[PDB]
Amino acid sequence: DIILTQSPAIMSASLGERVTLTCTASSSVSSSYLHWYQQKPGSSPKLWIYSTYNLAGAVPPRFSGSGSGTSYSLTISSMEAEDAATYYCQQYHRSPWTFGGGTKLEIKRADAAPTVSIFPPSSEQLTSGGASVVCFLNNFYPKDINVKWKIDGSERQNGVLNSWTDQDSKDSTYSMSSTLTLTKDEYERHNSYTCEATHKTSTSPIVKNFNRN
């Protein structure tokens, strides 16, 4: 019951930029018992810093940490691509031992609009009484995006499942998939299907449509 707060939860930086992550504790922790871990997707966390300042086995010296009481940080002097990852603080001052919720550090790159594509239900799928409409929003930055489905001009929220890729390690864009699942009878009661993507690179939505027949 010592809460570790990592604000902000998500951070962007360019390569070369100085970066600072903060860990804040609800009650004083003794600097000896404060730690940091790095995690990349699909890998285990790794010790990065222990007892506030001590770099761990293999941690390059561009990294430093400091703090005391309720105020801790981890600094990266000059960002490198390798340093994109999620970092957790952790305390051993009183039990139960806890981590903060982590700061995901991603790379800043130039803004980009999603390439949008809509696909009607295939005939194979309709022979099972299912009907999925798919919208791809590909290769965009920054990650924040809104996707709205319209059936004959009216918004639909029921039956929509999304999924996002991890920041692309080569070009630093993101992509998303949006899938609207209806029954076959449901799909055939209506004509117009639209996927509207809203994103900070335009004020008007990117709009993709088809009419079944």
Partner: protein
């Protein structure tokens, strides 16, 4: 050095599991072992600690009655036993060594991916996503269990410009899609084939996208 835990474990809801973590390359009794839970997409949550010499435990209250930790010092292996399983217990379970640095966790295992579902193996339906200078095509891979599937395009000779999205649990079954962008003078003249493998049901499915 090392720490070996199984990569995946499938268990029915209501049941129990006993995941094993085998150390090597150090004097096992000199270090405590901690277990940490990581829910898909989420942060880290301490379960508890075990003194490996003596067998004494301390528990995150939250997991009292969910998790039991034990040791066998003769085989150098720590154990966690989760009871009364629900979808809420689906998570990666890491064993970690507590390490002389002021209780900091210096070595981790690769983690055990526990899935709590009633589902039976179920092979996927593969549906072509054909539109109605670049063109985007796709493949919807729906209604399979368990993970993973692998999706390639023309067996791997379409590698660039592919996005294959993470699976989502639609029902108690998984669904996922994959997109490929090619130059428009390539398709429909040259063939584009979604190749989908699901090992668990020993199934491969090849699906070509037709106009």
């Amino acid at each position: 050095v090392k720490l070996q835990e199984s990569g995946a474990e499938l268990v029915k809801p209501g049941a129990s599991a006993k995941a094993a973590c085998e150390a090597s390359g150090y004097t096992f009794t000199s270090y405590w072992i901690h277990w940490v839970k990581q829910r898909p997409g989420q942060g880290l949550d301490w379960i508890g600690e075990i003194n490996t010499s003596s067998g004494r435990t301390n528990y995150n209250e939250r997991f009292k009655n969910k998790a039991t930790l034990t040791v066998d010092k003769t085989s150098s292996t720590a154990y966690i036993q989760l009871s009364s399983l629900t979808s809420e217990d689906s998570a990666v379970y890491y064993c970690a060594r507590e390490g002389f640095g002021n209780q900091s966790l210096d070595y981790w295992g690769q983690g055990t991916s526990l899935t709590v579902s009633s589902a039976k193996t179920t092979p996927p339906s593969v549906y072509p996503l054909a539109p109605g200078s670049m063109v985007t095509l796709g493949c919807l891979v729906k209604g399979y269990f368990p993970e993973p599937v692998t999706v390639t395009w023309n067996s791997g000779s379409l590698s660039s410009g592919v996005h294959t999205f993470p699976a989502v649990l639609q029902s108690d079954l998984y669904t996922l899609s994959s997109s490929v962008t090619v130059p428009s003078s390539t398709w429909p003249s040259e063939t584009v084939t979604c190749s989908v493998a699901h090992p668990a049901s020993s199934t491969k499915v090849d699906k070509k996208i037709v106009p």
